[PDB]
Amino acid sequence: TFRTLDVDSITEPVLTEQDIFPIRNETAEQVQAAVSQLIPQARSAIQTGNALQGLKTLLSYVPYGNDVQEVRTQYLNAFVDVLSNIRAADIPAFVKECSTEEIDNIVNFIYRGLANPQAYNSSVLLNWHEKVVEISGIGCIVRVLNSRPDL
């Protein structure tokens, strides 16, 4: 009886995720508009056979947050399509011509794309993951392990 009904959850409020990572200064409408502006540029770049430039442009800004679920899903769908619309033979040059933070975003989002395979194509994500881990190293996956949960 009295063994159940735990009380430790209220007397000492445990640290909650916003206490660990910096809070998002941008507003929901601002980031939503920014993503809604970035995505069609990526789609158009895919249409004109310049998928590398489209991915580079889409990689410049990356949204996050617990209140931006829908726009994050649209961003992820666009990113998955852009990456799947890239020839495989040109990957190493792209990977080598990036900064560490950009590669971190790439690996983070491809790994999140791996989490939902009932709607995506896993083969291209796995191939990209293999090549980026081969070239950049394991530090990218380390950063993935130590990234924000909302990312």
Residues that bind another protein (CB under 8 A): 3, 6, 8, 14-17, 20, 111, 114-115, 117-118, 122-123, 126-127, 129-130, 133, 138, 141-142, 144-149
Q: Tell me the closest approach of the beta carbon of residue 103 to another protein, in angstroms.
A: 14
Q: Tell me the closest approach of the beta carbon of residue 85 to another protein, in angstroms.
A: 18
Q: Which residue's CB is nearer to another protein, number 20 or number 23?
A: 20
How many whole angstroms separate alpha carbon 50 and alpha carbon 10?
55
User: Nearest Cα to 58, choosing from 40, 77, 42?
Assistant: 42
Contact 105/59 with Cβ under 8 angstroms? yes
Residue 1 CA to its chain's centroid (Å)? 46
Q: Tell me the closest approach of the beta carbon of residue 110 to another protein, in angstroms.
A: 10
Q: Which residue's CB is nearer to another protein, number 34 or number 135?
A: 135
Residue 68 is classified by DSSP as -
How many whole angstroms separate alpha carbon 38 and alpha carbon 47?
15
Q: What is the CA radius of gyration of the chain?
A: 19
Q: Tell me the closest approach of the beta carbon of residue 135 to another protein, in angstroms.
A: 12
Q: Which residue's CB is nearer to another protein, number 42 or number 128?
A: 128
Whole-angstrom distance between the N-terminal and C-terminal Cα of the chain?
42
Q: Which residue's CB is nearer to another protein, number 38 or number 94?
A: 94
